[PDB]
Subunit: 97 residues, 2 copies
């Protein structure tokens, strides 16, 4: 039918929008999880005595980005915002099971 | 120093591994969130009277994937596994704030 076709088209367009985003999140989450064990190391290094001492050494090349005033600060911020977004999503997904 | 260099190298290698995975998850989560409002539509369509009726019509071309026995079933499974993984991650991230 002409009308059955309309229903199917709408559903296919909906699936095509949503399904790749579901897939990409699953993939990204799995990759993140294999390395999240390293986060405390980086968080704890930023603003530590050693980080500051190293940042203020007279390097003969451009210092590593980890030694900058802002790079790991921004990483911590991105982490904390992600934590909040994951916390907010969790019960919403549970509701859709 | 030779040794200060060792500390910095280790931290830089750690950051280079972790930081892109954090970024990719943030990006994937944001994209998913803009379309998660469509999930109930697709979930509810699968195994519905209309879905089954449409799947059993005599289409003159290959039926749309949404009409298959397995495609949306697998999407629901992927969703439910993701829900559980997000629920498990949420308190772990809170602990690292
Ligand atoms: Ca396509
Ligand atoms: Ca590189
Ligand atoms: Cl690991
Ligand atoms: Cl490790
Ligand atoms: Cl939307
Ligand atoms: Cl919408």
């Amino acid at each position: 039918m002409k009308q059955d076709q309309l229903i199917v088209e709408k559903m296919e367009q909906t699936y095509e929008a949503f399904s790749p985003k579901l897939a990409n999140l699953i993939e990204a989450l799995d990759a993140f999880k294999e390395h999240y064990e390293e986060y405390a190391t980086l968080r704890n290094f930023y603003s530590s005595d050693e980080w500051f001492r190293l940042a203020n050494q007279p390097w003969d090349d451009i210092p590593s980005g980890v030694l900058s005033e802002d790079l790991l600060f921004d990483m911590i911020g991105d982490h904390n915002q992600l934590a909040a977004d994951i916390a907010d999503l969790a019960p919403i997904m549970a509701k859709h099971m």
